[PDB]
Structures are given as structure tokens and as C-alpha cells.
């Protein structure tokens, strides 16, 4: 019939962005 | 929208600059420049001479 392994720092920055700017439904 | 994407981009730029300084300290400079303070997303402070 990838991930360049500098993404730990970007991810921590994403968490800081989540806290500094929260989502709002 | 501007506040969120400007704050994220500026702290991204600070992270890039910190990674560059760690590259310079490891590879070529080495104790000719030292990181004094680094608060992620807040400030970076280097020491020369």
C-alpha cells in the first residue's frame, strides 16, 4: 500500500519571560 | 507586545555577550578580561587592565 546546546540559556530566558510576562486567556 | 518582545530580545543580546566573553576568556584572552558581575537579563560588567 536539532538543538544547538545553547538552548539551556534560551530556555531559562523563556522561563524568565513567562514570569515577567504571564499568559492571559 | 513591544514590551514583551523588546525585553526578551535585549536579554537575549546580553546572553549572547556573556557567552562571547566566556569564549574570549577560555580561548584567547584569559585573565586579561574578567567578568565582575553578571545578572541574567539585568547587567553584565567586565574588567580590563
Curated annotation (Swiss-Prot), chain A:
Disulfide bonds: none annotated. It is found in: Nucleus. It comes from the Eukaryota. Transmembrane segments: none annotated. Component of the Mediator complex, which is composed of MED1, MED4, MED6, MED7, MED8, MED9, MED10, MED11, MED12, MED13, MED13L, MED14, MED15, MED16, MED17, MED18, MED19, MED20, MED21, MED22, MED23, MED24, MED25, MED26, MED27, MED29, MED30, MED31, CCNC, CDK8 and CDC2L6/CDK11. The MED12, MED13, CCNC and CDK8 subunits form a distinct module termed the CDK8 module. Mediator containing the CDK8 module is less active than Mediator lacking this module in supporting transcriptional activation. Belongs to the Mediator complex subunit 6 family. This is Mediator of RNA polymerase II transcription subunit 6. The chain holds residues 149 to 192 of 246 of the full protein.
Curated annotation (Swiss-Prot), chain B:
The gene is MED14. Ubiquitous. Belongs to the Mediator complex subunit 14 family. It comes from the Eukaryota. Signal peptide: none annotated. This is Mediator of RNA polymerase II transcription subunit 14. Component of the Mediator complex, a coactivator involved in the regulated transcription of nearly all RNA polymerase II-dependent genes. Mediator functions as a bridge to convey information from gene-specific regulatory proteins to the basal RNA polymerase II transcription machinery. Mediator is recruited to promoters by direct interactions with regulatory proteins and serves as a scaffold for the assembly of a functional preinitiation complex with RNA polymerase II and the general transcription factors. Interacts with GATA1. Component of the Mediator complex, which is composed of MED1, MED4, MED6, MED7, MED8, MED9, MED10, MED11, MED12, MED13, MED13L, MED14, MED15, MED16, MED17, MED18, MED19, MED20, MED21, MED22, MED23, MED24, MED25, MED26, MED27, MED29, MED30, MED31, CCNC, CDK8 and CDC2L6/CDK11. The MED12, MED13, CCNC and CDK8 subunits form a distinct module termed the CDK8 module. Mediator containing the CDK8 module is less active than Mediator lacking this module in supporting transcriptional activation. The chain holds residues 292 to 340 of 1454 of the full protein. It is found in: Nucleus. Disulfide bonds: none annotated.
Amino acid at each position: 500500500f536539532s538543538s544547538i546546546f545553547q538552548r539551556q540559556r534560551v530556555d531559562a530566558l523563556l522561563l524568565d519571560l513567562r514570569q515577567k510576562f504571564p499568559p492571559k486567556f | 507586545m513591544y514590551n514583551c518582545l523588546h525585553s526578551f530580545c535585549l536579554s537575549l543580546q546580553l546572553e549572547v555577550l556573556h557567552s562571547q566573553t566566556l569564549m574570549l576568556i577560555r580561548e584567547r584572552w584569559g585573565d586579561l578580561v574578567q567578568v565582575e558581575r553578571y545578572h541574567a537579563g539585568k547587567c553584565l560588567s567586565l574588567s580590563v587592565w
